[PDB]
Design a protein around this ligand. Structure first.
Ligand SMILES: Nc1nc2[nH]nc(CC(=O)O)c(=O)c2c(=O)[nH]1
Ligand SMILES: Nc1nc2[nH]nc(CC(=O)O)c(=O)c2c(=O)[nH]1
Lengths: 262, 262
């Protein structure tokens, strides 16, 4: 049981009543546009609103200048038209600042504050919850889980040293990153181990490659496989699940929650 | 790891390589017919064949005379046109004899050999695998799991005393029987406990009521909820899952199997 809530500015996410669903926003860049066109932002608001209606609790919105021209226009519209906390999917320090300014409540660094250490400071400054996902430029592990926890801890070191509060820290195993198909199945089977570090954990496996490797199905045929990873993750104690199929995953999460007793 | 295979006459089911999917056959009685009409049996063969193509490993086919007039005609067609072991879903001794005669390889007693003790003898005789599901005429438990295991053991007593071989015994928790919505969620959260009795376990929760009670959805909207129960069950060590949505549940079972390492 957590003795605190995830404080996200206007909104507050409770980590005990249920598994929090983070829906991946569908960004489809408009040609002839640096970012901001009616088509792009509108299609984005329709999705945000849609996911919001089918169970989402968070909306994850994903050069350095281009990235800002594209993401800012959406964080502005979505935050205004959809009453839900927004997280910015990036590792770059600048993009993270801009995004929180436009309205983003959470940071989502796929490189755990290691590719641009300054982003940890951006997070500490604005005092927003940050997601440190496991990642590395190689897949040569002595002991997968042992090294994952070691790498994660080093992201936590960079985060805390930057002034990040323990309560504004969330971990992610990094399923699908610097891991072979078999190594991903190993992380899944051992996810509970991350819990020893004492922080909430977010699981991102939606429609990923290792599900295709196992079921041998294309990307648009990985719904039942995503579900399985989600159920096993909730059962191993995950607080959040980052998915595409918000409607389907919400029911599975909810039914899971009832059974485990969350 | 099991040190033996489920011997079903012509076919042999291995309990270690994967979770065995038992598909529920769609029996829709034909009016003006005691049983056997072309419509009934044909529609039944189409389903059996369909499930067979989407992952099933077993086909479960469900007065005393009527029951025989209806079930025998199908076990005959299905067994002949579909190369897969067939199980007869009944508790009555006579129906069980007839069914195995027509071609049924497994018995599926929803009353664990307690409503008609003679069925255990039918099973011992023909030497076929039998499924003892938990059930009772009341829901007044002192300790749910403790009493479930106690009741199950009494079905095992009736079975073994009848001459049934330990290797031809399969247990089922009886989700949805003599259990309140909350009690079903309790059985699910504690399923691993059944494993202490030393027998393979079959889980039947497909589209059941407690999933509607939790998700608050009608029967045709319980696919994501069935999946969750299936994934948690496989994770708690189930060898078989009795489902309606064979295509969907097979992928989830398969992905589960990869992750847990079955
Ligand atoms: N925290 C987190 N962020 C991500 N951002 N982008 C991706 C790329 C993607 O959508 O496949 C991802 O997988 C994850 C993840 O698993 N976890
Ligand atoms: N073994 C077993 N047999 C059944 N037969 N019929 C039913 C009725 C049904 O299809 O809902 C059932 O739930 C089960 C079960 O859970 N388990």
């Amino acid at each position: 049981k957590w003795d605190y809530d995830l404080r996200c500015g206007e909104y507050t996410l409770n980590l005990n009543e249920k598994t929090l669903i983070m829906g991946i926003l569908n960004v489809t860049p408009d040609s002839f546009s640096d970012g901001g066109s009616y088509n792009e932002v509108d299609a984005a608001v329709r999705h945000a609103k849609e996911m919001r209606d089918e169970g989402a609790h968070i909306i994850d919105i994903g050069s350095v200048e281009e990235e800002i021209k594209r993401v800012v226009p959406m964080i502005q519209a979505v935050s205004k038209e959809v009453k839900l906390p927004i997280s910015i999917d990036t590792y770059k320090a600048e993009v993270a600042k801009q995004a929180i300014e436009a309205g983003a409540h959470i940071i989502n660094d796929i490189w755990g504050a290691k590719a641009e250490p300054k982003i940890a400071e951006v997070a500490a400054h604005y005092d927003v919850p940050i997601i440190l996902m496991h990642n590395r430029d190689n897949m040569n592990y002595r002991n997968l889980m042992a090294d994952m926890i070691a790498d994660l801890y080093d992201s936590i070191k960079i985060a805390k040293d930057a002034g990040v509060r323990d309560e504004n820290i969330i971990l992610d195993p990094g399923i699908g990153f610097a891991k072979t198909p078999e190594q991903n199945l190993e992380a899944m089977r051992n996810l509970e181990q991350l819990n020893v570090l004492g922080y909430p954990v977010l699981l991102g496996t939606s429609r990923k490659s290792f599900i295709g490797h196992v079921l041998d199905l294309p990307v648009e045929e990985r719904l039942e496989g995503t579900g399985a990873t989600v159920c096993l993750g909730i059962e191993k104690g995950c607080e959040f699940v980052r998915v595409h199929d918000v409607k389907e995953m919400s029911r599975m999460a909810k039914m899971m929650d009832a059974m485990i007793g969350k």
